[PDB]
Amino acid sequence: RPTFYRQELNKTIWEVPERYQNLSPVGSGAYGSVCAAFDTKTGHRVAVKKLSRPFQSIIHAKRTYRELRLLKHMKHENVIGLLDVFTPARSLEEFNDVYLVTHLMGADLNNIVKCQKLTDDHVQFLIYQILRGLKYIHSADIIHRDLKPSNLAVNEDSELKILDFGLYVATRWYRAPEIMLNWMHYNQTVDIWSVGCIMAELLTGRTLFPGTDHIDQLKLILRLVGTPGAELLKKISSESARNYIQSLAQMPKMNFANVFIGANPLAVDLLEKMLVLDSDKRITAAQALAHAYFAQYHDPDDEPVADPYDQSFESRDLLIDEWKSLTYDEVISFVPPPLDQEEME
Ligand SMILES: Nc1nccc(-c2c(-c3ccc(F)cc3)ncn2C2CCNCC2)n1
Ligand SMILES: N[C@]1(CO)[C@H]2C[C@@H]3C[C@@H](C[C@H]1C3)C2
Ligand SMILES: [Ca+2]
Ligand SMILES: [Ca+2]
Ligand SMILES: [Ca+2]
Ligand SMILES: [Ca+2]
Ligand SMILES: [Cl-]
């Protein structure tokens, strides 16, 4: 049995194995808060997320199970995955706390662009990694739906991982129009719109669509991409929303070459393929990885897809204690990955 110790962090007691030392808070995550730590078994730096009240309600209990199942499945260099999962509980009857462990990533994408004029080669690398991660999660029928710079973890060498996928006032500036406006259908390319918004901001240093509300953001979007056709209205349930959009003065699409002056023309071309209102005509992650903009990084042998992911639990309503027992089962069955899982190409 590992010896646990207790430490008050973020005004609450954490109980963690002696293996993990020097815990220091590094912010909140989805449904929990996060500490950096030193893993004395491997000498590696890790991030430990303590889930907040994981079994307080049917909502918390199912999302705890969902997050653990998702993170146990994610095995990709550009997607947050699990090094460890632990609980101080000695049995299911005591089980009330869940801690998730991953590699430490010191920053988010906002730390990278804030005080640094990025080079085009560096922008290519950052966006390439997002797209590689999205190809992987999308291949498992997992969509992020709220991709944005604060959901991209980055380390000291600009290596990037997507987090908080497949799951307080949030920024909406990177959300796909079909998501922000609650349209009746969408596909995995909601995340590609978000990539376009992020990439645009990495190239210009300015937020692409900094709208003050739903309607102001939509107006900024339409100024760039032009007024949509009537076929777009098909997707919008609310008559007042449809009537509003229809009543707008028509706007032509802008030439993105006039918006992103001085950018690599290949970057402009990629943006034109991402920032399209018609989600059926938006480029996919796998298609974008083949785009000439990423030629110096693209490597088809190193852009893998995911193993099939069984999401049948999503349609089921179970009792709190059933989700709790399922979660306990997933904690106990977890197999830590090898420290070194990669080989020279
Ligand atoms: N510093 C760092 N490094 C890696 C991940 C995180 C992390 C996690 C997280 C997820 C799963 C897990 F098992 C462990 C941690 N959730 C949110 N964040 C950060 C995301 C950027 N803002 C601060 C919190 N933070
Ligand atoms: N952000 C910008 C330029 O500042 C605004 C004006 C126009 C349309 C959108 C996207 C670009 C170009 C909003
Ligand atoms: Ca390679
Ligand atoms: Ca190796
Ligand atoms: Ca490495
Ligand atoms: Ca090869
Ligand atoms: Cl599975």
Burial 98-129 (b: 16+ CB within 10 A, else e): bbbbbbbbebbbeebbeeeebeeeebbbbbbb
Q: Is 105 in the pocket of ligand 1 (CB under 6 A)?
A: yes
Which residue among 208, 225, 261 is best mutated to probe the pocket of ligand 2, counting the most ligand atoms within 8 A of its Cβ? 208
How far is residue 258's CA from residue 65's CA, in Å, rounded to a whole number? Answer: 48
Residue 102 in contact with ligand 1 by CB distance below 6 A:
yes
| Residue 196: alpha-carbon gap to chain centroid | 14
Spatial contact of 5 and 18, defined as CB atoms under 8 Å apart: yes
User: Across the strands, what pairs with 100?
Assistant: 49, 85
Query: Rounded to the nearest whole angstrom, what is the distance from the C-alpha of residue 252 to the centroid of ligand 1?
Result: 41
- 121 within 8 A of 297, measured Cβ to Cβ: no
Q: Whose CA is nearest to atom 10 of ligand 1?
A: 49
Torsion angle of C-alpha atoms 130, 135, 140, 142, degrees rounded to 10: 40
Nearest to 147 by CA among 81, 206, 193, 186: 193
Ligand 2 atom at shortest distance from the alpha carbon of 221: 9
Distance of alpha carbon 17 from alpha carbon 25, whole angstroms: 17
| 17-35 burial: b if 16+ Cβ within 10 Å, else e | bebbeebeebeebebbbbb
29 lines ligand 1 (CB under 6 A): yes
Annotated binding residues for ATP, as ranges?
26-34, 49
Give dist(CA 135, CA 46) in Å, integer: 25
CA 345 to ligand 6 centroid distance, Å: 5
For residue 208, give the ligand 2 atom closest to its CA: 1
Could you tell me the sign of the dihedral formed by the alpha carbons of 338, 155, 80, 195, in that order? negative
Written as six digits, the tokens of 312 are 């049948």
Instruction: Give the number of the atom of ligand 1 that is nearest the alpha carbon of residue 103.
Output: 4
Please, what sign has the CA dihedral across residues 315, 179, 30, 104? Answer: positive
164 in catalytic set: yes
Q: Which amino acid is at 198?
A: I
Which of 33, 34, 48 has most ligand 1 atoms within 8 Å of its beta carbon, as the pocket-test mutant?
Answer: 34
The amino acid at residue 333 is: S
